[PDB]
């Protein structure tokens, strides 16, 4: 219902290493009155899945309860059911895929009984996007309009398709559940067609759990791993993707990775860049890097130092009636400066531009 007067730009980070993987993450509240995003990041899983990893972003709505419960418990609902455990030995593709389906459906109903028993007041819901990573497979998991992508061989190899109510099959389901899609929203309100929680949207008599107005059913894709070609995976809520496309963000992260191996920092830059491109939502990014992720380049670091220094001289020159930061950014944009980070553009350089402005106009 409301925005803050000024954005909360404080970063919450995590990082880790194991099973040949490196990860960083960054979350920021931004312009929104609340922080309703959640996440999971775990390298090495219980019960003989030490060599497996799991990462996920949760974009909560109408509260954070559903998202928070998911970020702590979705993983064991997924792995601790009979479908995931099916066959005697290691789980098959089908096992893993049905395991995730069941995990999603069972946690949703689990939360529903919990809320029904304790007379819960919140009507919250949550998207989930994530990857379950085995020695030989990346399993992409999507439920809602959060998004994940795989960069392989300097390119977008795969990305998750957002569940929007106006998508043909989502629309079909919603209409069979006796609702409608008005513009982009389920009955004029909800901007997602798939999510955990939203129990008010799951009350149609004579319709299965996956045939309600809002569905908890996940979409899973098996991608065979490529030791040689797999570079990195990005997972993020719509707050990021609203203001950057797949190619852009993929290129941007690449440009950043060529400057630092610090992944929390790369994730920070994504979130800030997105804030400065005009995103007014909560923002959460997870970055998972494979052994052949882009490496720090001596030249790229130098190019960045030269750009940084150049940007600082430009700021000094511009302040000669003493223009404000907004007007300095305007001038710099109209200068069509070359060699700005791909995807990030000027926005990705605002922290550098602003630090300078503050050194020269600290009042």
DSSP 190: B
Q: How far is the CB of 342 from Mn ion (least distance, A)?
A: 25
Instruction: Classify residue 274 by burial, with Cβ atoms within 10 Å: 0-12, 13-18, 19+.
Output: buried
Q: Do residues 212 and 204 make contact, with C-beta atoms less than 8 angstroms apart?
A: yes
Burial annotation 1-12 (CB, 10 A radius, 16+ → b, else e) = eeeeeeeeeebe
Question: Measured from the CB of residue 240, what is the shortest distance to Mn ion in angstroms?
Answer: 9
CA–CA distance, 141 with 120 (Å, rounded to integer): 28
Binding site for Mn ion (CB under 5 A): 36, 59, 61, 237-239, 281
**Closer CB to Mn ion, 41 or 237, in the complex:** 237
**Is 5 known to sit in a ligand binding site?**
no
Least gap, CB of 199 to Mn ion (angstroms): 17
* Nearer residue to Mn ion within complex by CB, 213 or 274: 274
H or E, element range at 117: helix 93-117
CA–CA separation, 113 and 108 (whole Å): 9
The residue among 61 and 163 lying less far from Mn ion, judged by its C-beta, is 61
User: Could you tell me if 300 and 259 are in contact, meaning their C-beta atoms sit under 8 angstroms apart?
Assistant: yes
Chain breaks in the chain (C to N over 2.5 A) after: 320
Cβ 237 to Mn ion shortest distance, Å: 5
Is 281 annotated as belonging to a binding site?
A: yes
Residue from 231, 201, 196 nearest 216 by CA: 196
**Closer residue to Mn ion in complex, CB, 36/345:** 36
Is 59 annotated as ligand-binding? yes
Q: How far is the CB of 339 from Mn ion (least distance, A)?
A: 32
141: Cβ contacts below 8 Å, ≥ 6 apart: 56, 100, 128, 129, 130, 131, 132, 218, 219, 220
State the nearest-atom distance from the C-beta of 61 to Mn ion, in Å.
5
Instruction: Judge whether 261 is annotated as a binding position.
Output: no
**Separation between Cα atoms, residue 209 and residue 203, nearest integer Å:** 9
Q: Which of 179, 239 has the CB closer to Mn ion?
A: 239
| Closer by beta carbon to Mn ion, 59 or else 230 | 59
Binding residues: 59-60, 238, 281
Binding-site residue numbers for Mn(2+) are 59-60, 238, 281
């Amino acid at each position: 219902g409301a925005f803050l007067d000024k954005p909360k730009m404080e970063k919450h980070n995590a990082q880790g290493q194991g099973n040949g993987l490196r990860y960083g993450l960054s979350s920021m509240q931004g312009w929104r009155v609340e922080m309703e995003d959640a996440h999971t990041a775990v390298i090495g899983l219980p019960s003989g899945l030490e060599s497996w990893s799991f990462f996920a972003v949760y974009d909560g709505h109408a509260g954070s309860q559903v998202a928070k419960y998911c970020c702590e418990h979705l993983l064991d609902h997924i792995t601790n059911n009979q479908d995931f455990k099916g066959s005697a030995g290691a789980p098959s593709v089908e096992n893993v895929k049905n395991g995730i389906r069941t995990g999603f459906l069972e946690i949703d109903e689990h939360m529903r009984v919990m809320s029904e028993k304790k007379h819960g007041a919140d009507r919250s819901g949550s998207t989930a996007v994530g990857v379950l990573i085995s020695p030989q497979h990346t399993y992409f998991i999507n439920c809602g309009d959060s998004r994940g992508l795989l960069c392989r061989n300097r390119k977008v190899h795969f990305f998750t398709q957002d569940h929007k109510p106006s998508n043909p099959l989502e629309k079909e389901r919603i209409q069979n559940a006796g609702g409608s899609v008005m513009i982009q929203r389920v009955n004029g309100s909800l901007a997602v067609s798939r999510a955990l929680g939203d129990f008010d949207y799951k009350c149609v008599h004579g319709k299965g759990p996956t045939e309600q107005l809002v569905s908890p059913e996940p979409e899973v894709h098996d991608i065979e791993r490529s030791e040689e070609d797999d570079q990195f995976i990005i997972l993020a809520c719509d707050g990021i993707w609203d203001v950057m496309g797949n190619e852009e963000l993929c290129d941007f992260v690449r440009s950043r990775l060529e400057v630092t191996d610090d992944l929390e920092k790369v994730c920070n830059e994504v979130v800030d860049t997105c804030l400065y491109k005009g995103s007014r939502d909560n923002m959460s990014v997870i970055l998972i890097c494979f052994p052949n992720a882009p490496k720090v380049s001596p030249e790229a670091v130098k190019k960045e130092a030269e750009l940084d220094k150049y940007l600082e001289c430009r700021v000094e020159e511009i302040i000669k009636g003493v223009p404000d930061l907004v007007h300095v950014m305007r001038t710099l944009a109209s200068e069509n400066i070359p060699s700005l980070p791909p995807g990030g553009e000027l926005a990705s350089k605002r922290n550098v531009i602003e630090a300078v402005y503050n050194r020269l106009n600290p009042y």
